[PDB]
């Protein structure tokens, strides 16, 4: 799963904009991989972090944590540094039994990708529409 | 958010399998959508929960969670009553503040679909890979 | 009483403004339709709640309820994300006998629209004068 | 808002009927003033009664309460009390704060008239149809 | 089982078509899906509604409840407001197994449809005869 | 309501099976039909019973109830005495006034058969799809 630049295009309500997710690296103390390198000033900018586990004797499974961060910087009208006042984002945790089938794992992946394109979740997220 | 036409396509390594969910109602006391058209029996295995998109004064901030179960059950040796042995489960929280806009919420939802489509999450899930 | 956009023509003291009440859905634990215009997580959000129901046979009658909310606040000067501090609203409950026809129920609905547009209710706002 | 006769045209199921509500006054210890059919008996049958604040001792608030009743009087089997019939009232409240503007209040009054004319309330009231 | 108008007939002893249940929608708090005849007055119509299930994992029994109401009303000796003097009724609940099933329920649904034509019920129900 | 073996055709999803319910006497109360299937195991597992309306008395001692019970066994290889692992069931209650013609009684049984054959209940019961 080489941490190569990921470009996610055709995103937003109408599928019109893009995000560059250019890798900062993988953390040596915890296995966490993260995508940044936007050229933009830190903590105001959009970031994507994906961490993984090993099929450890203490878990019997493999996990993937996918967290997307797209905070808004605001900026007080005065002083110095800008700062985030608004959070607007999501965190997907996956669990795959170490003895699971790869296709089962592959289904879970795309099932979410497909739900994210489903009118029910589109309305629940973009319009904040109550299900029914 | 009307419950209708929810089919998840491009499921699996080949991008060819589908799962039909077309939710047909929500939990009457919680506002929780129940997604599965797997079959009279398979609907007890292949399941998606999407909730709670219903707004409130005691929520302020907006949150939706999606719970995806894609289990395989094994038939008893020489008997009735098959049961699940393997998952292949995902659970995502979408969390936006009280003042968030639709474009940012949408950005993330479509960003996740694009991210799932991206090779980084294909090898992370199918080969269980750290990002190298 | 479908979850279709309701466009309200000419409103306000001089009959000049209009609303587009983009439907969101029915809040399932409450059973009430909800329309709102921007789709932002609400504070300063126009909101319309509508329902028709059949109470249990302790009440033995039919009801329709409508609530129209008009929140407002001043600018969060020097910062971001202003809250709602003031709200005006309509709240109408229509209580009907189960043996009544649609036409009389309609008279109650239509007479109110005709009366709301009449000089007495115009003065009970414009001047804020008491009724005699 | 001293009462005056109000002619409510374009009313009922087809939006084509006319009903005239003539004033009935009392010093409004009971804040509700009355507009009703000329009578003598119909005056006590089809009526709208209206209370306009005059905020209470709690310094709350500007409001208007309109109560609309349109019974079907019926003469049958030799009786002498046709005026005793089917209920009830549409209880209408225009709810405001203390220093709401006249424009804010007017929107509530005219938005409601505009919504009463909308298919959403037409079907909820005449056919008693649910939002689905 | 999307609600749609249901036409029923050859129900009475004359073999004639009778019954059409038109308005549709589901009360989401109650889990009750309508169909009915009240073109104007609800209190005089015929109704068939179904309780629409979604069992917990501690039951898995998707009970379907078919509620049948067939009231008869009179004016006859009066000028207005017909009201119910007699009512025929049925209430049928269908159980489901803990692992679900398929054909076995089809047998129960169709067994009952066939059973209702059995000479034992024709007299046990039409003449109220004890079986004997 | 003479006791005779009841033979019902049109059973199952394709309408091709036949179920035969042989009398087992009437003593829960006189006339409560007890009809069971053929063979030692079906004699334990599959049956239909029918309740009995009484001579006047307070109208509590009424309501024909048809109970369709279809438990089914599973066996070990070479096992003697099969036992139930699944049960399908229909709890069918009828209610009439003591004055309800003869026609209404017939009407409700056939209306129910007409509903059971309807796509609305085919999907609610065989496909487990809520009627939304």
Numbering used by the authors:
A (entry chain P), B (entry chain G), C (entry chain T), D (entry chain J), E (entry chain Q), F (entry chain H): 1 to 132
Sentences from the paper on this structure:
The canonical ssRNA phage Qβ has a genomic RNA (gRNA) of 4217 nucleotides, from the 5′ to the 3′ end, encoding the maturation protein (Mat); the major coat protein (CP); the minor capsid protein A1, which is a read-through extension caused by a leaky stop codon for the major CP; and the β-subunit of the RNA-dependent RNA replicase (Rep). Like many other viruses, the CPs of ssRNA phages can also assemble into virus-like particles (VLPs), which are not infectious. Through a native infection without engineering the amino acid sequences, we found that Qβ CP can form diverse VLP capsids, including the T = 3 icosahedral, T = 4 icosahedral, prolate, oblate, and a small prolate form elongated along the 3-fold axis.
Besides the 5-fold non-icosahedral capsids, Qβ can also form a small prolate VLP elongated along the 3-fold axis, which is a new conformation of the virus capsid. Moreover, the triangulation number of the two caps in the small prolate is T = 1, which means that Qβ has the potential to form a T = 1 icosahedral VLP. However, we did not find the T = 1 capsids in this study. The “over arched” type, which provides more curvature with a θ angle of ~130°, includes hexamers from the oblate and small prolate VLPs. When over-expressing the gene containing only the cp and read-through (referred to as A1) fraction of the Qβ genome from a plasmid, the percentage of the oblate and small prolate forms increase further to 35% and 12%, respectively. Two forms of these VLPs, namely, the oblate and the D3 symmetrical small-prolate forms, have not been observed before.
